Amino acid sequence: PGEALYRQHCQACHGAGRLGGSGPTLLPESLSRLKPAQAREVILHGRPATQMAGFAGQLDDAAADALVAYLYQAPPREPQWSAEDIRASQVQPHPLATLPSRPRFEADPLNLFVVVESGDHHVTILDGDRFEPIARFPSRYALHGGPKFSPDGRLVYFASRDGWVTLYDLYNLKVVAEVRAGLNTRNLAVSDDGRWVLVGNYLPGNLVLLDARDLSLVQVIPAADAQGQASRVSAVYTAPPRHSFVVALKDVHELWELPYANGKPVAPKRLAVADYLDDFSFSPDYRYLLGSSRQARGGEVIELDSGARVASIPLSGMPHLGSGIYWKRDGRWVFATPNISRGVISVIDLQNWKPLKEIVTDGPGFFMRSHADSPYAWTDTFLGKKHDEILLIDKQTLEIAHRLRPSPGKVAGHVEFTRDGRYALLSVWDRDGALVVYDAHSLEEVKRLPMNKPSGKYNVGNKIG
Ligand code: DHE
Ligand code: HEC
Numbered sequence: 001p002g003e004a005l006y007r008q009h010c011q012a013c014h015g016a017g018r019l020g021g022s023g024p025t026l027l028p029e030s031l032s033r034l035k036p037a038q039a040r041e042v043i044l045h046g047r048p049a050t051q052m053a054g055f056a057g058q059l060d061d062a063a064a065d066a067l068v069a070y071l072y073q074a075p076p077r078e079p080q081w082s083a084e085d086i087r088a089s090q091v092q093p094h095p096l097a098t099l100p101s102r103p104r105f106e107a108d109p110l111n112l113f114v115v116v117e118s119g120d121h122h123v124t125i126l127d128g129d130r131f132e133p134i135a136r137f138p139s140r141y142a143l144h145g146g147p148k149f150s151p152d153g154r155l156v157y158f159a160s161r162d163g164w165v166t167l168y169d170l171y172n173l174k175v176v177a178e179v180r181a182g183l184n185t186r187n188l189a190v191s192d193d194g195r196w197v198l199v200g201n202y203l204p205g206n207l208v209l210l211d212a213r214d215l216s217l218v219q220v221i222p223a224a225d226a227q228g229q230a231s232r233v234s235a236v237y238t239a240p241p242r243h244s245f246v247v248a249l250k251d252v253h254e255l256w257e258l259p260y261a262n263g264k265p266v267a268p269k270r271l272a273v274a275d276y277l278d279d280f281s282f283s284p285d286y287r288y289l290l291g292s293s294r295q296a297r298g299g300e301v302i303e304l305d306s307g308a309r310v311a312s313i314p315l316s317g318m319p320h321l322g323s324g325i326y327w328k329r330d331g332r333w334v335f336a337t338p339n340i341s342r343g344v345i346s347v348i349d350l351q352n353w354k355p356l357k358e359i360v361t362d363g364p365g366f367f368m369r370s371h372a373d374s375p376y377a378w379t380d381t382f383l384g385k386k387h388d389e390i391l392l393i394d395k396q397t398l399e400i401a402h403r404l405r406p407s408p409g410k411v412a413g414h415v416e417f418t419r420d421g422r423y424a425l426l427s428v429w430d431r432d433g434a435l436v437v438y439d440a441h442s443l444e445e446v447k448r449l450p451m452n453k454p455s456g457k458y459n460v461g462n463k464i465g
Pocket of ligand 2: 006009010011012013014022023024026030031034039042043047050051052053055067
């Protein structure tokens with residue numbers, strides 16, 4: 001009965017077959033982060049300050065539950081998104097060929113910040129020296145993952161949960177092109193020569209290769225092991241020194257490398273893995289791959305050339321290895337990583353792959369960042385009842401040195417530095433949130449920009465260097 005209800009009240013914005021429109025996509029995969037009870041409240045009483053109105057006046061309890069069950073029930077057949085669908089979605093409001101190649105502003109283009117405002121779905125381009133905005137524009141719904149840049153830092157590529165890819169030109173402050181690569185998307189990667197964008201999708205289970213200059217479609221690459229078993233893509237990353245993309249697969253015992261030195265990467269090199277990999281991190285020299293297993297079997301280290309498993313790292317809880325950092329301690333490489341289920345910062349010695357120590361915190365965090373100029377590692381306890389402070393771990397002592405509390409009570413997380421590391425920018429993820437600027441040397445606040453749930457911020461210089 002929910003189908004008819006959806007057609008009369010919802011399809012006006014959430015689109016036919018729930019694929020999206022004025023409002024977001026409402027497939028089961030789309031709502032994986034939304035509990036049905038929460039989806040039920042949003043339907044009855046709407047979202048404040050959004051175009052989603054409450055329907056409690058037109059629907060009763062039975063109809064309410066019917067819609068909820070309908071949204072979370074799998075369709076009789078899996079929805080498609082073909083090459084034809086992708087090409088038809090392409091738009092090009094400002095092709096590069098028609099735009100000059102000089103910045104239209106004073107700000108240092110290498111110190112600009114891309115700031116995601118996920119509360120009202122906007123993006124701010126921020127002068128990294130004055131800490132003031134030079135542009136702001138609405139974005140696609142639910143941006144996730146770090147926006148990727150071109151090698152020269154001029155272009156930036158956004159990926160939305162619902163599969164929309166946006167190409168923005170920082171020099172002219174204009175949207176260049178957009179295309180829908182899939183229905184449920186993880187992340188995208190840009191090749192180190194600037195030619196290619198590779199989109200890793202959950203739904204469909206495929207990779208989508210786009211031309212990096214206009215987001216046009218090059219080829220759709222189904223994700224399936226050598227036996228033909230279909231799989232979702234966990235994540236895609238670029239290995240510059242290897243001039244290749246590296247793809248983690250969610251559901252098959254396979255790992256892919258797609259080289260692009262000799263042209264469009266459409267043929268994968270398949271490496272067998274003993275256990276599934278959800279996310280991974282590259283060693284500073286891209287020789288080794290640190291992978292986190294879905295099962296609590298600890299971490300896994302793999303040599304990329306051969307594909308051999310060289311070490312197994314026991315890890316407390318479930319480490320978010322994909323966002324870890326490295327640095328030199330006693331002239332030796334060390335690796336730190338936050339955690340999703342336990343309040344700990346796991347630190348690993350790269351030399352013998354031996355875990356050094358486990359730093360205790362007030363709860364599991366989501367992010368970790370540093371800089372060659374900062375003597376600390378900056379992490380958080382994003383996922384805990386205590387979550388309003390940003391922890392600064394001294395690199396040499398491996399102990400929580402200082403703590404920053406931008407807005408007591410509200411959730412704080414994610415750090416990004418200016419290109420010279422002189423300042424650090426922190427986010428307060430709240431409806432009454434803010435982007436807060438701190439002197440990374442004196443650790444004193446300098447400026448505060450109110451924003452509606454600002455998420456990540458990304459410095460051009462640091463990301464392309
Ligand atoms: C694989 C991956 C990346 C690296 C992508 C890249 O940049 O190439 C990433 C990055 C990110 C980055 C990029 C930061 C960076 O510094 O690069 C941010 C801000 C972020 C905010 C969130 N992440 Fe993320 N995130 C996951 C996966 C990932 N997140 C999950 O699996 C998880 C736990 C659940 C999910 O449904 O995806 C998840 C939940 C969250 C959130 O709910 C956050 C807090 C808010 C949101 O928008 O959903 N993730
Ligand atoms: C256009 C005005 C809409 C109609 C008609 C319906 N919905 Fe909606 N919905 C719309 C928007 C723009 C948004 C996004 C709000 C925001 O966060 O900015 C939503 C949101 C939802 C959600 C939450 C999705 C999520 O958080 O992941 C749900 C579950 C939802 N809408 C369901 C829903 C149903 C069942 C509708 C018919 C009764 C319906 N919506 C109508 C826009 C519009």
